C-alpha cells in the first residue's frame, strides 16, 4: 500500500515544482543587467595574524569587529586583537579535534566542537583570571560541524547524525531537535533576527529550520555535490551556499527556489567558505586551490583574486561592520584584507 | 604601544606567544596514528597497555621514549569524506582486518581501497594488521577459502591463504612514496608494539630524509 503514498509524494513534488516554475517569471541577473558592474577590487595583506601551529579550521569575528576567535587542529582556540595582532586569549581545548568555533554576540562565552560529539562552552569574563570550561553539551552521536550562538543562554549546532540541535546552556539538554536530512550536515548560518536558520548537508541539499516550533520551513535542491559552507545575505531572506562541485549558489527564502549560480570553467576545486559584505553587494568565496576569488553578488562576475595563501582556505569571515575580511587557511596564518 | 596598558598587553601577548610556541614544541614531539577497520576486528584490542584517557577514542601510550597516539574513529556513524582530512598530518594509518569474517572481507577490501586511494592520504603510510591467526587458521580447515574468494587457485594451506590475502590487500597501493607494512596479529599471546614502533620509525626517517634535501 506504500506505492500509493510514494505516488502521492511524487505528484505533490510535481505540483510544487510547477508552482515554483510558475512563480519564476524572470531571473535576478536579467533584471539587474542594467546595473553597472563593480570593477576589479584590489585588496592587500594588511596584517598576518600568526601564532597558530596547525591547520585553522574555523574563525569568527566578534560583534566589535576587532576580536576574533580562531580554532586550530593543535587543540588551541586563540582570541586575537585584529588591530594590533595581539593574542587576548589562548584557550587550550580538551579534545584537539575541533572544526567549529563561535564567539557569543555578548562576547562573554566561546563555543568549540568537532569529532568529540560534544560542544564545549567556555566563559571568558570569569571572576578569576583564567578561562574555564563553562559547560560541555553531549547529546550528539555525530561530529559537530558548525555552532553559532543565539544569546548567552541558547546555542544552535549541526552534527553528523544528519541532525541539528538547539540547546539551552544553563540546563545542558537539547532544547529542540531538527531532523530530516539524509546526509551529514556540514554548516549552518544564523539569520540576523535569530529566528530562522539554514543548514546544508552532504546530500547536496539545504533545509531551512526555525527556532520557535521545530520542523523545517523550506528545502533547496540545487547542487550536485557536497556542501562545505553557507552564509546569509544581510537582509536575512537570501543565502549563498558553497559546494564541492566548484559552483557557489544563491537561493532566496521568499522565492523558495534558486536565484543564481556562480561558476567558472577555470575553477574545478570545491568551495570551502563563503561570506557576504556589509550591504551584500559583494560576495567572497574560499576555494580549495589556495586562492579566494571574489564574485559579484548581483552580476556573477569574478572580480579579484586574494592569492596570498600557501594552502587550502578553510575559514573566511567578514566583520560585523565590514571593515576588513579575514581569511584563514591550512598554512596556519590568518590574513586580513582591506 | 605608546601607552602603558598597550605595552602591558603586548607583554601579555609575548607571554602567550612563549606558551604557544612551547606547546607547539611538546605537541610536535608526540607521534600519531589513526586506527581504522571494520567492527569486531580487534580495532580496540591491539595493545593491552592502553591508558585510554561515544565518538573519537584517544589512546596516549608511550614506548621507547616516544609518545604514540592512537585515534579510534569508530562509532562515528557518518561519512568519512568530511573529517578524514583532519588526520591529513598523521604519521601513519593503522588498518585492522578480521580474517574470521568471510562476508565482511569484501567490505574491508573496499574500505582499504578507499583509504589508500584518497587524495589526502597519498603519502601517509599504512600499517596493515591482520588479526586472529588461530580463528582463521581453524576455519580454513573447517571452511575452504573459496566461498569468500572463488578466484583462489593456490593451495588451501594456512600460509598460502595468508599470503594471498596479503597480496590482495597490498594490490590496492598503485602509488609511490607510500608503503604498506605487514604484520599478522591475534591479540592473544602477541606483543605488537614493536611493529608499530619500527614502522613509525621507518616512516619518520623517510619523511626526514625527504624533508632535509636528501633522497
Amino acid at each position, epitope marked *: 500500500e506504500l506505492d500509493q503514498l510514494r505516488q502521492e509524494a511524487e505528484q505533490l513534488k510535481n505540483q510544487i515544482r510547477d508552482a515554483r516554475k510558475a512563480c519564476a517569471d524572470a531571473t535576478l541577473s536579467q533584471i539587474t543587467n542594467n546595473i553597472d558592474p563593480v570593477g576589479r577590487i584590489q585588496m592587500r595583506t594588511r596584517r598576518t595574524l600568526r601564532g597558530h601551529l596547525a591547520k585553522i579550521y574555523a574563525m569568527h569575528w566578534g560583534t566589535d569587529s*576587532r*576580536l576574533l576567535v580562531s580554532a586550530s587542529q593543535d587543540g588551541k582556540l586563540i582570541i586575537w*586583537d585584529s588591530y594590533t595582532t*595581539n593574542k*587576548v*586569549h589562548a584557550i587550550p581545548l580538551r579534545s584537539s579535534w575541533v572544526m567549529t568555533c563561535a564567539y557569543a554576540p555578548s562576547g562573554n562565552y566561546v563555543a568549540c566542537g568537532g569529532l568529540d560529539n560534544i560542544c564545549s562552552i567556555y566563559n571568558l*569574563k570569569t*571572576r*578569576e*583570571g*583564567n578561562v574555564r570550561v563553562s559547560r560541555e553539551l553531549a547529546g550528539h552521536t555525530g561530529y559537530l560541524s558548525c555552532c553559532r550562538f543565539l544569546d548567552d543562554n541558547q546555542i544552535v549546532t549541526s552534527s553528523g547524525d544528519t541532525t541539528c540541535a538547539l540547546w539551552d546552556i544553563e540546563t545542558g539538554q537539547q532544547t529542540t531537535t531538527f531532523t530530516g536530512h539524509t546526509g551529514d550536515v556540514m554548516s549552518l548560518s544564523l539569520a540576523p533576527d535569530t529566528r530562522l536558520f539554514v543548514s546544508g548537508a552532504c546530500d547536496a541539499s539545504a533545509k531551512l529550520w526555525d527556532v520557535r516550533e521545530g520542523m523545517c520551513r523550506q528545502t533547496f535542491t540545487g547542487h550536485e555535490s557536497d556542501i562545505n559552507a553557507i552564509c546569509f545575505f544581510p537582509n536575512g531572506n537570501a543565502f549563498a551556499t558553497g559546494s564541492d562541485d566548484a559552483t557557489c549558489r544563491l537561493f532566496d527564502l521568499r522565492a523558495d527556489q534558486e536565484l543564481m549560480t556562480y561558476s567558472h570553467d577555470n575553477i574545478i576545486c570545491g568551495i570551502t567558505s563563503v561570506s557576504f559584505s556589509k550591504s551584500g553587494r559583494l560576495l567572497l568565496a574560499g576555494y580549495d586551490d589556495f586562492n579566494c576569488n571574489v564574485w559579484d553578488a548581483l552580476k556573477a562576475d569574478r572580480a579579484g583574486v586574494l592569492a596570498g595563501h600557501d594552502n587550502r582556505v578553510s575559514c573566511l569571515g567578514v566583520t560585523d561592520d565590514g571593515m576588513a575580511v579575514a581569511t584563514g587557511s591550512w598554512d596556519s596564518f590568518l590574513k586580513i584584507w582591506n | 604601544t*605608546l*601607552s*602603558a*596598558e*598597550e*605595552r*602591558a*598587553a603586548l*607583554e*601579555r601577548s609575548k*607571554a602567550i606567544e612563549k606558551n604557544l610556541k612551547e606547546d607547539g614544541i611538546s605537541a610536535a614531539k608526540d607521534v600519531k596514528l589513526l586506527l581504522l577497520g571494520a567492527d569486531n576486528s580487534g580495532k580496540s584490542t591491539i595493545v593491552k597497555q592502553m591508558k585510554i584517557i561515544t565518538g573519537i577514542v584517544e589512546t596516549h601510550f608511550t614506548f621507547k621514549n616516544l609518545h604514540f597516539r592512537l585515534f579510534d574513529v569508530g562509532g562515528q556513524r557518518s561519512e568519512r569524506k568530511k573529517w578524514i582530512h583532519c588526520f591529513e598530518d598523521v604519521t601513519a594509518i593503522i588498518f585492522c582486518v578480521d580474517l574470521s569474517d568471510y562476508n565482511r572481507m569484501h567490505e574491508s577490501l573496499m574500505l582499504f581501497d578507499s583509504i589508500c586511494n584518497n587524495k589526502f592520504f597519498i603519502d601517509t603510510s599504512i600499517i596493515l594488521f591482520l588479526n586472529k591467526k588461530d580463528l582463521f587458521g581453524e576455519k580454513i580447515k573447517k571452511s575452504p577459502l573459496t566461498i569468500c574468494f572463488p578466484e583462489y587457485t593456490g593451495p588451501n594451506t594456512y600460509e598460502d591463504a595468508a599470503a594471498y590475502i596479503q597480496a590482495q590487500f597490498e594490490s590496492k597501493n598503485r602509488s609511490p612514496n607510500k608503503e604498506i607494512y605487514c604484520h599478522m596479529t591475534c591479540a592473544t599471546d602477541t606483543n605488537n608494539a614493536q611493529v608499530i614502533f619500527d614502522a613509525v620509525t621507518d616512516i619518520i626517517i623517510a619523511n626526514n630524509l625527504r624533508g632535509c634535501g636528501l633522497y
Partner: single-chain antibody
Amino acid sequence: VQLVESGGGLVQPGGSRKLSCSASGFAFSSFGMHWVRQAPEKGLEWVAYISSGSGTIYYADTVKGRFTISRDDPKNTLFLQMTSLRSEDTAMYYCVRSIYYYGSSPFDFWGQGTTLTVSSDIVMTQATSSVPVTPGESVSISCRSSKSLLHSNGNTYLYWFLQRPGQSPQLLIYRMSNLASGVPDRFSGSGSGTAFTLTISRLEAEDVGVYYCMQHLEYPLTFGAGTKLEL
C-alpha cells in the same frame, strides 16, 4: 577570592621589613600586582607595581632604591622589602590585583591591608573634598589632570575608586566609560581630556565614602586627594 596581607607592626627608623601578601581563589600567575599605601589621615599613594611574569617593575618617584618587590607564583605570594624606612612610611599598605589585556578591568580587587608604623608626575587634582549630600539626590564630583590623558588609540585612562570607612576600596569605573563587574548602574563616568566627571544618580546608602580618581597614562601612577561624602 582573597588577598591577605601580613608583616605589620612598628619598625625603628632606618630598619628593614618584609611584607607578604597571600592570594587564594584566582590564577595569581596571570595578574599584574600593585602595592599602594595610604597615610593615616591622607589619600592613596601608589608605591610599586610588578608585572605578570615579572617582566616590568615600576616604583614611585619617592621610593626608588629603598624598596623592592617580588612575587612567588607557586605559593601565590607577593613580597615587598622596605629598607631605610623614614617617618613618612607609617602608612597602611594595600595589595591590588590587575589583569592587563584588551577590555580587561584592572585594579578591581583590594586586600584587607596591614598598617605598619615607624617610630615629571601627572598632578591629579580634585577641586572639592567634602560635599554634604543626602540619599535620594544625584551627586556629581570632578577630577582634573595636568596632561591630556586621551591617547591616540581613543582610550582615556581614568579609574574611580570608593573607599569605605575601615574597608578596602574597589574599582567603580575604568576608563571613565566602562562599569566594572559588581558595580551598580548608579555610578556613571563622563568627560574629556583633563576634565572628568563622576555622577551618582539616586544616591542611597552603602555609598558613603571617599572617592579617588587615578590616571594610568604613564608610570609613575598618581592618585588624587580624595572627596569624602557626608550626610
